[PDB]
Design a protein around this motif. Structure first.
Motif, PDB file in Angstrom:
ATOM      1  N   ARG B   1       6.098  23.175   0.623  1.00 46.38           N
ATOM      2  CA  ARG B   1       7.419  23.795   0.732  1.00 46.38           C
ATOM      3  C   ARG B   1       7.609  24.653   2.001  1.00 46.38           C
ATOM      4  O   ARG B   1       8.745  24.993   2.341  1.00 46.38           O
ATOM      5  CB  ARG B   1       7.787  24.573  -0.556  1.00 46.38           C
ATOM      6  N   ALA B   2       6.500  24.983   2.698  1.00 48.28           N
ATOM      7  CA  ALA B   2       6.505  25.809   3.913  1.00 48.28           C
ATOM      8  C   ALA B   2       7.110  25.114   5.139  1.00 48.28           C
ATOM      9  O   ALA B   2       6.709  24.001   5.490  1.00 48.28           O
ATOM     10  CB  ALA B   2       5.099  26.301   4.223  1.00 48.28           C
ATOM     11  N   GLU B   3       8.077  25.788   5.785  1.00 42.53           N
ATOM     12  CA  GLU B   3       8.751  25.317   6.993  1.00 42.53           C
ATOM     13  C   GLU B   3       8.446  26.237   8.191  1.00 42.53           C
ATOM     14  O   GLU B   3       8.267  27.448   7.996  1.00 42.53           O
ATOM     15  CB  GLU B   3      10.260  25.189   6.761  1.00 42.53           C
ATOM     16  N   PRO B   4       8.372  25.694   9.432  1.00 38.12           N
ATOM     17  CA  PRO B   4       8.061  26.552  10.595  1.00 38.12           C
ATOM     18  C   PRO B   4       9.142  27.580  10.966  1.00 38.12           C
ATOM     19  O   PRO B   4      10.239  27.504  10.428  1.00 38.12           O
ATOM     20  CB  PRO B   4       7.817  25.538  11.725  1.00 38.12           C
ATOM     21  N   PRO B   5       8.882  28.562  11.865  1.00 36.68           N
ATOM     22  CA  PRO B   5       9.956  29.485  12.240  1.00 36.68           C
ATOM     23  C   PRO B   5      10.758  28.887  13.386  1.00 36.68           C
ATOM     24  O   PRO B   5      10.327  27.893  13.968  1.00 36.68           O
ATOM     25  CB  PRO B   5       9.193  30.726  12.703  1.00 36.68           C
ATOM     26  N   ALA B 160      -0.068  26.944  11.710  1.00 36.66           N
ATOM     27  CA  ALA B 160      -0.217  25.592  12.260  1.00 36.66           C
ATOM     28  C   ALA B 160       0.443  24.627  11.285  1.00 36.66           C
ATOM     29  O   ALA B 160       0.270  24.768  10.069  1.00 36.66           O
ATOM     30  CB  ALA B 160      -1.689  25.236  12.452  1.00 36.66           C
ATOM     31  N   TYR B 161       1.239  23.683  11.815  1.00 30.56           N
ATOM     32  CA  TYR B 161       1.991  22.728  11.010  1.00 30.56           C
ATOM     33  C   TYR B 161       1.763  21.294  11.433  1.00 30.56           C
ATOM     34  O   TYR B 161       1.822  20.960  12.619  1.00 30.56           O
ATOM     35  CB  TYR B 161       3.497  23.021  11.078  1.00 30.56           C
ATOM     36  N   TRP B 168       7.118  19.143   6.449  1.00 33.14           N
ATOM     37  CA  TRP B 168       6.212  19.980   7.232  1.00 33.14           C
ATOM     38  C   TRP B 168       5.104  20.491   6.314  1.00 33.14           C
ATOM     39  O   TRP B 168       5.387  20.987   5.216  1.00 33.14           O
ATOM     40  CB  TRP B 168       6.959  21.188   7.836  1.00 33.14           C
ATOM     41  N   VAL B 169       3.849  20.381   6.759  1.00 35.27           N
ATOM     42  CA  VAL B 169       2.729  20.889   5.974  1.00 35.27           C
ATOM     43  C   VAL B 169       1.996  22.024   6.705  1.00 35.27           C
ATOM     44  O   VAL B 169       1.529  21.828   7.829  1.00 35.27           O
ATOM     45  CB  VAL B 169       1.819  19.796   5.323  1.00 35.27           C
ATOM     46  N   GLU B 170       1.958  23.221   6.084  1.00 32.50           N
ATOM     47  CA  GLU B 170       1.287  24.398   6.635  1.00 32.50           C
ATOM     48  C   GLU B 170      -0.230  24.250   6.436  1.00 32.50           C
ATOM     49  O   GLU B 170      -0.713  24.295   5.301  1.00 32.50           O
ATOM     50  CB  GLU B 170       1.824  25.689   5.987  1.00 32.50           C
ATOM     51  N   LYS B 171      -0.961  24.026   7.543  1.00 26.97           N
ATOM     52  CA  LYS B 171      -2.407  23.815   7.552  1.00 26.97           C
ATOM     53  C   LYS B 171      -3.204  25.126   7.687  1.00 26.97           C
ATOM     54  O   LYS B 171      -4.213  25.288   6.997  1.00 26.97           O
ATOM     55  CB  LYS B 171      -2.803  22.784   8.631  1.00 26.97           C
TER      56      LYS B 171
END
Ligand SMILES: *[C@@H]1O[C@H](CO)[C@@H](O[C@@H]2O[C@H](CO)[C@@H](O)[C@H](O)[C@H]2NC(C)=O)[C@H](O)[C@H]1NC(C)=O
Ligand SMILES: *[C@@H]1O[C@H](CO)[C@@H](O[C@@H]2O[C@H](CO)[C@@H](O)[C@H](O)[C@H]2NC(C)=O)[C@H](O)[C@H]1NC(C)=O
Ligand SMILES: *[C@@H]1O[C@H](CO)[C@@H](O[C@@H]2O[C@H](CO)[C@@H](O)[C@H](O)[C@H]2NC(C)=O)[C@H](O)[C@H]1NC(C)=O
Ligand SMILES: *[C@@H]1O[C@H](CO)[C@@H](O)[C@H](O)[C@H]1NC(C)=O
Ligand SMILES: *[C@@H]1O[C@H](CO)[C@@H](O)[C@H](O)[C@H]1NC(C)=O
Ligand SMILES: *[C@@H]1O[C@H](CO)[C@@H](O)[C@H](O)[C@H]1NC(C)=O
Lengths: 457, 457, 457
Positions: B1-5, B160-161, B168-171
Motif C-alpha cells: 500500500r506504500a507510495e513514494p513522496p 527505496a521503491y 509501488w513496493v517499499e523495499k
C-alpha cells in the motif's frame, strides 16, 4: 621539523567567472570545515587550514563589583520617646564618622519602631536601631561587562611545503583573517600574488553568546581571565537578588549601590528581648557572605561549544569568544594557463574509547577518545548493546593531526540517545564496513545542579 | 500500500573529489528543502525526505510552581499597647500551628501599626494584624524550565521503491539523524553500503526559540505537555510580578518563595473601622487567584514557525522544538563505473482558497488551502483586487503528497501586504502563465491581544 | 537618463535540473552580495540588484508612556494623635479632588509616622504627610513596543537596458520581494515570462535585532520615528528603575502604573524640622525629571549594522529593520535552445581617506571614504605605519555606482587592530600589487559612554 596538516577529502566545484567587454577565468569552489585543512598543487604543496572562528562582541557596559561580607548590629530603646535611636540618626543615613569605621567597610543605618515590649513595661513601644556593615569578601573583585551583538572573524593558516630530500620543509606560513557578517572577502594568499582566496559565510554562526551581562575575576597584573555568567545587574539596574549591587568607585572603595535609600528595603530586623539587647536580622538579598554566594564556573568549562570567552585586552572594549563547534565556510580559489589540483590523505583509526555523559547542565554528549587516528571518522550510535542493533544516530568526527594520533572530543547527541549502555561503531572514511570498531559505551547521567534564615544578636 | 513522496525538481551540481597519492570520484550536490523529497535511480527508486528539523535545548533550571489562591483576614486593636496584635506575633512570621491550618495551605503574617482611630477614641493609635493564606488554585501545577542554546538535528527518511507488477513496493525505510551545528555529517544510506549521504548546514537555523524561562502543565501520568511562555522567574529570582513565586517543595506542598520575609512588601492593608473589624487589603503581586491570572496558550499555537515545543521525556533534561519553517540543507551524494540519475514529478494544483490574516499576536500571513495539489506552487500577491494589478510579493509553497491532495498552510507576508482585499494568483511549476488561478482574497485583522483594586474585610 | 548598476564579477556554477518521465534543463547558479548587482545577456542587458535585506518583527506589546516631572510637598504634625495627617488620608490613596489639581497632573499620597521631634516637645512622635505629583515632561510621549522573532525579506531590483544610439535606455524596472526563512522562493523575472529567479538563504541573517522592548517618540501627524533601546518595562512589568512606569490611558492622561499601591515603596521622606515644615524627600526610581532622564539616540545611529529600524505604518503591527550589513544569498537563474551569458565591469579606485575609530559604544571600525571608485576593492590592514609591515587583517568593500564615485563606508575591524596609527592599503579587483594605494591611518578611541540625592522642602 614542520609537517603539513591532514589534507581533507573535499568535493570541488568548477565555477566560471563572468566576462567583461575585454579579452575565461575558472574558479575552484568547496566547503571548508572548522579545524580542517585543504591541500592543493599548482601546475610546492599549498595548505589552507580554518584555524579559528571568533565572535568579537563590543563591551557596552563596565563596572567593578565584589562580594559583600555583611554584619548587622542593633541597639534597642524601650521608650519610643527616647532621644537615643531615632529616624534622624538611623533612617536613610550612612553610619557617622564617630561610629567605629574600617577603611574598606561601608555602613548603612536602619530604624525599626513599633517593637513589642519584651524586656520592657507593658505600655512601652520599643524602637530598634541598626548599623548594617559591608566589607569585600576575601578581596575578590570582579568586572561586569555587557556584551552586545558580535562581528564574526575566521582565521586561516596558509602554509606552503616543499619536499626537499626526505623531509617536509615549511617555506611560507601566514595567518589570514576574514570577516563573516557581510559579503565575500577576498585577498592574495601566496607570496607571488598568483593565488587568491575568497571566503563567504552563508548566514550567522551556528552558535553565539547571547547579548547580556557577563563577568570575570580581576587579578594582580593580567586583570581579566575567562568570562562567566550568573544573574548580574546591568549598570542602571539595582536588583538585590542579582550580582553587582556591591560596587567599587573611582578609588578602590566598595559601596552598596544606592545603600542609604535601599537599606530599609533590604535589611529586616525585629527585637527578641529589648533589655537583653537581642534581635533577629536578615538581608532580603542574594550574593553575599556569609552563606549566600556560590561562584559559577567559567563559560568555556560549562558550555561545550565554547573553547574560550575572554575580554581581549586591557582597554576592555571587546570580548572574544572562540568557537569549538561551527558550520563550514564557502571557499573559492582563483588565479598564463595553469592547473589547480586538490589533494587529500587517507583516514585511519586504530581504536576508540568513551562514555555517554549527561552532565549537571543537561548537555547530552559522547565523550570520545580516538587512538592512532587521523582524518574523517564516521560514527553510528545503536539502539542497544548489540552491534547489529538499529542505528539511532550517525555522526562524523574530524582528527587534525597528519600522523595517526590519540585525541579527546565531545560529540553532541540527540535526545533519542537516552539512558543505558549501547553500542557505538566507528569507521574511518573509505574503509570496508567489516573494518569498523564497535564498542559498548556506558551511560553516566549527573543530576541537574542548580542554585536556590534569621541571624541572632 | 506504500507510495513514494513527490520527487522535487532540483538542480544538481557535479562536484569532483580531491585525489590522494593512490589510484576520480564524482559527487552529486543539491539543496534539499524542509518537508521535501528528492528521488534518484542507480545504474529500484531511492528517495530522501527531509522529515524534521529540531532544536534540542538543554534544560538548565527546573522548579514546580502553581497558581496561588489568596485570602487575607485581619484583626484590629484600638490600643497600640495591647498585648494582642504585635510585631512579635505578626511581623516576619508564618501563622502558628494553633491558627486553623489546611494541609495544602501556607499562611504568612503581616503587621500594620499607625492606623487611624476610626471606631476608637481620638487618642488611640490602632494596629492591624493579618494572616495571608495561599492555596493551590484548581490544583493546577506547572513545571518551570530554563532552556539554553540548542543543538540542531535533521531527520531524513530514506525509502527505496521497486515497481513490481502495477503497484509501488517499499523495499527499505530508515530514519537518518544528522547534527547541523558543526561540519559535514556523513553516513552510508542504502542496505548495500554503496551510496553515501553528506549533510551540511550553512549557519544557524532561520529560527530558534530564545534562551529563557518556559513552562508546561504537569499532569497525571504523562507529566509534561506543550511548552508555553509567560513572564516567569528564574530559580534564583523572586519577582512577585512574574509567575513562579508560589513554589512546590520535595513533598507536594506549595509555599510562597521567601514568604515570611517578603509578605510585608507584597501585602498592603489599612483599617476602614477598627471597632467594626473592617479593612482594605491588596496583594502588590501578579499571577494569583482571584482575578489576577490568565494562562497563555502554548508556543506552537501562537507562533507559526513552531510545529511542536515539548520536554523530551520524564528525565526532564532536553526540550525538543520541531520547526514548521526552516531553510534548506546542502546535500552531497557519493558512491566500478555507475551512473546516478535524479528524477522529479510534475507540479499540479486544481484550485485554492484562503484569507489574509493579521492575528492577535501581529503575525501577518496568508492562510492558504490548496485543492488537488502536489509539488512546487508559485504564488504572487497583487496591489489591488484586479488580477492584472502590480505584483507586490511573490512566494513558493511546497505540497508533500505524491497524489494531488487538499492541504492547509501558513504563508508569511511582508508589511507591504497591508489592509484590504487583493488578488493572489497561484501557478504550479512549469505551467503556462494562462494556467494560473487568481482569486480576490479577503483581509482579517484581529486587534492586538495583550495582558495588563482593594478588597474589603 | 537611467544608467545600469556596476555589474559584479561573479563565479557561475552550471547546475542540471533533475528529469521527469517526459521529454535536460540547465541552470546558472551564483552567490549575490547585499547592495550588489549581477548582469547577463540572453541569446537587452538584464540586471539583478539585491537592494534590501529586511526583518519584519511582529509587535506583540504596545503601550504609551512619557517622562514624569516629579514634585513632592509634605506637611508635618508634631502630635501623633492629631486628626490632621493620618493613614486614612495619606496612605494608599490618590490626592483628593479638593487638593489643587492640574488636569495633566496625577497625585499620590504618602504617610510617614515615627518622626523625630525636631521642632516639637521631647515626647512628641511627629508624622509627615506628602503629595507626590507627576506631570508629563515637555509633553514628550513615547510608544513602547515588544518586538518578537522576525520574518526575513530580500528586495531585488530587476532592470533591463537597451543601448539605443549612444545612451543606455531603461526598458523594464520591477521590485522583487522574496521570503528568506524557508525553502527556495521562485518567480518569473522578465516581462516575457522566459527567465525565472530562485532565491535561497543558507540559514538566519548574520544579524538580527534581539527580541525585546524598544520604543520611539510619538509626534503630530506621522506618529512614530526611529526605534530606540533603553531599559524598558514590558506591559506586565512595573520596575521603577526602568522606563514605562509613567503610562498614558485611553484619553491622553498619564498615570503612575499602580501608583496608589506603589508610592510608599518609591517615595521616601524624613522630617528636617517639624515646626519649620522642612523635610528630605527622594524618589527611589529612575527615568524622571528633574535630573534622572537621559534619552538614548536611535538604534541606527548607534549600531553600525542597522540602516533603519522603524514601526512600519499607523496600524503598529510590524517593526521593519533594514540591514546595512548581511551575508550573500544563493541565486539560480533558469529559463528552444538559448544561451545565458554573465557580464561584469572592471573595478577602479583613484584614492581613499579614513580613520580607525573605537566609538563610545565600543564598535571597532575603519571609517572609509573612497574617491573615484566603483566595484570590488580589496583592503589590507598592516601591523605598523610602514607599508611593507605585516598584514594583520584583510577585507573587501563593494562600491555600487557604475561610474567612478566618492562614497563613505564602515568596515568593522577585529580586536587585533588595536591602538595607534597603521598603514592600510587598498587595491581594486584585478589591478597589479604595484597599483595599490597605501596610507597611514590615524586611530581615535572614544571612552565608553554609559549611564549610572535628597531634595529639601
Ligand atoms: C598526504 O598528501 C600528500 C599529497 O597527496 C602526500 O604526497 C606528497 O606530496 C606529493 C604529492 O602531492 C608527492 O610528490 C610527495 O612525494 C608526497 N610525499 C611523500 C612523503 O610521499 C603526502 O605523502 C601525504 N602524507 C601522508 C602522511 O600520507
Ligand atoms: C514520479 O516520478 C517517477 C520517476 O520519474 C515516475 O516514474 C516511475 O519510475 C520509473 C522511472 O524512474 C519508471 O520505470 C516507472 O514505470 C514509473 N512508474 C509509473 C507508475 O509509471 C512516477 O510514475 C511518478 N509518479 C507520479 C504519480 O507521476
Ligand atoms: C559594463 O558592462 C557592460 C557589459 O559588459 C558593458 O558593455 C555594454 O553592453 C554590451 C556588452 O554586453 C555592448 O554591446 C555595449 O556596447 C556596451 N556599452 C558600451 C557603452 O560600450 C558596459 O559598457 C560597461 N559599462 C562601463 C561603465 O564600463
Ligand atoms: C572526557 O574524558 C577525558 C578522560 O578520558 C577527560 O580528560 C575529559 O575531561 C572528559 N570530558 C568530559 C566533558 O567529561
Ligand atoms: C486556516 O483556515 C482553516 C480553515 O480553512 C483553519 O482550520 C485553520 O485553523 C486556519 N488557521 C489560522 C492560523 O487561522
Ligand atoms: C565618517 O567620516 C565622515 C566624514 O569623512 C562622517 O560624515 C561620518 O559621519 C563618519 N562616520 C563615523 C561613524 O564616524
Amino acid at each position: 621539523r614542520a609537517e603539513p596538516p591532514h589534507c581533507s577529502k573535499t568535493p570541488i566545484v568548477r565555477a566560471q567567472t563572468s566576462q567583461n567587454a575585454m579579452s575565461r577565468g575558472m574558479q575552484m569552489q568547496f566547503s571548508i570545515g572548522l579545524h580542517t585543512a585543504v591541500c592543493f598543487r599548482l601546475y610546492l604543496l599549498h595548505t589552507i587550514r580554518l584555524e579559528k572562528l571568533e565572535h568579537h562582541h563590543p563591551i557596552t557596559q563596565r563596572y567593578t563589583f565584589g562580594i559583600p561580607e555583611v554584619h548587622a548590629s542593633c541597639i534597642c530603646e524601650c521608650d519610643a520617646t527616647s532621644s537615643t535611636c531615632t529616624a534622624e540618626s538611623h533612617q536613610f543615613t550612612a553610619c557617622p564618622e564617630s561610629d567605629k569605621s574600617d577603611e574598606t567597610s561601608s555602613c548603612y543605618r536602619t530604624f525599626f519602631p513599633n517593637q513589642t515590649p519584651i524586656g520592657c513595661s507593658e505600655d512601652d513601644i520599643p524602637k530598634l536601631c541598626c548599623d548594617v556593615r559591608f566589607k569585600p569578601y576575601k578581596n575578590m573583585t570582579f568586572l561586569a561587562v555587557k556584551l552586545e551583538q558580535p562581528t564574526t572573524y575566521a582565521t586561516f593558516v596558509y602554509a606552503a611545503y616543499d619536499f626537499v630530500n626526505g623531509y617536509w620543509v615549511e617555506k611560507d606560513k601566514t595567518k589570514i583573517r576574514s570577516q563573516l557578517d557581510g559579503g565575500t572577502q577576498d585577498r592574495h594568499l601566496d607570496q607571488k600574488r598568483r593565488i587568491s582566496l575568497a571566503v563567504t559565510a552563508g548566514g550567522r554562526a551556528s552558535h553565539q553568546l547571547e547579548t547580556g551581562m557577563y563577568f570575570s575575576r580581576t587579578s594582580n597584573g593580567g586583570e581579566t581571565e575567562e568570562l562567566r555568567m550568573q544573574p548580574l545587574n546591568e549598570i542602571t539596574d539595582n536588583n538585590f537578588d542579582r550580582l553587582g549591587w556591591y560596587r567599587m568607585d573611582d578609588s578602590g572603595h566598595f559601596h552598596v549601590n544606592n545603600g542609604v535609600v535601599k537599606m530599609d528595603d533590604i535589611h529586616k530586623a525585629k527585637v527578641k528581648n529589648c533589655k537583653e539587647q537581642t534581635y533577629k536580622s536578615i538581608l532580603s538579598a542574594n550574593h553575599y557572605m556569609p552563606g549566600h554566594f556560590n561562584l559559577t564556573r567559567p563559560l568555556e568549562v560549562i558550555k561545550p561549544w565554547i573553547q574560550s570567552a575572554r575580554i581581549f585586552d586591557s582597554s576592555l572594549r571587546q570580548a572574544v569568544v572562540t568557537h569549538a563547534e561551527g558550520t563550514n565556510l564557502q571557499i573559492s580559489i582563483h588565479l598564463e594557463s595553469q592547473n589547480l589540483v586538490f589533494f587529500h590523505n587517507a583516514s585511519r583509526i586504530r581504536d576508540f574509547s568513551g562514555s555517554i555523559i549527561v552532565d549537571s547542565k543537561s548537555n547530552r554528549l559522547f565523550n570520545l577518545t580516538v587512538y592512532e587516528a587521523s582524518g574523517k571518522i564516521d560514527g553510528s550510535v545503536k539502539m542497544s548493546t548489540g552491534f547489529g542493533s538499529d542505528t539511532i544516530h550517525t555522526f562524523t568526527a574530524y582528527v587534525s593531526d597528519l600522523h595517526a594520533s590519540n585525541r579527546s572530543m565531545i560529540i553532541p547527541l540527540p535526545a533519542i540517545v537516552g539512558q543505558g549502555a549501547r553500542a557505538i561503531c566507528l569507521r574511518a572514511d573509505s574503509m570496508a564496513d567489516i573494518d569498523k570498531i564497535c564498542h559498548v559505551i556506558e551511560y553516566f547521567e549527573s543530576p541537574l545542579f542548580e542554585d536556590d534564615g534569621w541571624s541572632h544578636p
